[PDB]
């Protein structure tokens, strides 16, 4: 069914939008009101597009796939990881590389090296070599730990990618549009509904609104695994 | 209110949907009323509404779309004038063109009223070709 009451969003930071002279006017038949230097998002079409969002997420996992979620902002960094360890999904820790989806051959070989270095890190032969080799392995393992630590459990492309709002990850988003991979994401008051093909326009100033829509879709995916 | 009242409506259509805005406000003269009457019934647009603002009866016209795409309307509308003021064109019931085989229509001014190629080909009448869309 996947409902959310209108009052649960209407109380929290959902209509609590963004700045009133920064609006990108492809929301001009969309945005409801404006108050005190902050936009007011129309919540009817918001919840309907979230109804559609959970229909098209739960249906896509009902076919049986693996989903992906991007996490980069450092305002919603660990909340995605909480929204991805229980939900079985593979996730971006803090920061993104341009090429992790489209140039995935070299990323795949980079996972050969990252898999071998985790195999050496577990095996206890790390203390054999002195501080030089241990320093190099800790540095490259730190950088791959920054990116590839959260997506070790993926081979191939996902079906639906859900991203940190719009700003920091136009890179990952445009790799998704080049690959054709459908994405269902969050929109601010001043961004594009036509980048992805369905997305969920709600402000992400609130951590609890991010925890709201992401927690909603986490139970959508886990009930997708419920089979 | 320039020189043409038909490049008025038409250029408001092209300039309307090339910026993807699904709403037109134009004047409602007799020939504009007739064109939108023979244009809503042919599936190009959705609705035409007369109203008033300072007791000046206008047409707001809702264009067609589809769903959330790269662009929410797939088939670009492609409106074009033919009989320019200063170069009038006139056709018999022979010359009257089947636009793209029929996927476009050629709205034209018969002695009856203004028709399409269907409603002026069966009549056998001919007249001044206003414009053809496709």
């Amino acid at each position: 069914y996947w409902n959310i009451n209108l009052e649960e969003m209407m109380e929290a930071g959902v209509h609590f939008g963004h700045g009133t002279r920064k609006w990108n006017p492809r929301m001009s038949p969309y945005i409801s009101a404006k108050c005190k230097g902050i936009h007011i998002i129309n919540l009817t079409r918001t919840a309907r597009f979230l109804s559609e969002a959970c229909d098209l997420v739960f249906d896509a996992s009902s076919r049986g796939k693996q989903f992906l979620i991007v996490g980069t902002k450092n305002k919603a960094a660990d909340s995605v990881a909480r929204a991805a360890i229980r939900a079985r999904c593979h996730y971006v820790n803090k920061k993104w590389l341009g090429g992790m989806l489209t140039n995935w051959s070299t990323t795949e070989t980079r996972l050969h090296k990252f898999r071998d270095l985790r195999m050496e890190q577990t095996a206890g032969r790390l203390a054999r070599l002195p501080k030089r080799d241990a320093a190099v392995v800790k540095r490259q393992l730190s950088h791959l730990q920054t990116y590839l630590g959260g997506i070790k459990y993926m081979t191939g492309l996902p079906d639906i990618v859900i991203i940190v709002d719009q700003q920091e990850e136009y890179t990952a988003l445009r790799e998704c549009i080049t690959l054709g991979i459908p994405t269902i994401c969050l929109i601010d008051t001043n961004c594009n509904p036509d980048l992805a093909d369905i997305s969920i326009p709600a402000n992400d100033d609130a951590i609890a609104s991010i925890r709201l829509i992401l927690t909603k879709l986490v139970f959508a995916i886990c009930e997708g695994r419920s089979s | 209110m320039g020189k043409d009242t038909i490049a008025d409506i038409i250029t408001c259509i092209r300039n309307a949907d090339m910026n993807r805005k699904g709403t037109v406000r134009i004047v409602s003269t007799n020939i504009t009323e007739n064109i939108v009457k023979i244009l809503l019934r042919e599936g190009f647009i959705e609705n035409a509404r007369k109203h008033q603002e300072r007791n000046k009866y206008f047409l707001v016209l809702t264009l067609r779309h589809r769903r959330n795409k790269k662009g929410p309307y797939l088939n670009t509308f492609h409106l074009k004038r033919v009989s320019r003021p200063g170069l009038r064109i006139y056709s018999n019931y022979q010359r009257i063109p089947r636009i793209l085989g029929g996927m476009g229509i050629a709205i034209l001014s018969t002695s009856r009223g203004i028709m399409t190629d269907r409603e002026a080909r069966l009549e056998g009448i001919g007249g001044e070709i206003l414009c053809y869309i496709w």
């Binding site: 559609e52 690959l179 054709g180 991979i181 459908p182 093909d197 369905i198 | 779309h65 589809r66 959330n68």
Partner: peptide, 25 residues
């Protein structure tokens, strides 16, 4: 086969991104 599956996915989504921008709300 993989490319075809990807295409089918994209179609599904575009239709899912075709049913309800019309109507709905």
């Amino acid at each position: 086969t993989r490319e075809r599956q990807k295409l089918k996915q994209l179609f599904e989504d575009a239709y899912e991104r075709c049913r309800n921008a019309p109507m709905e709300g």
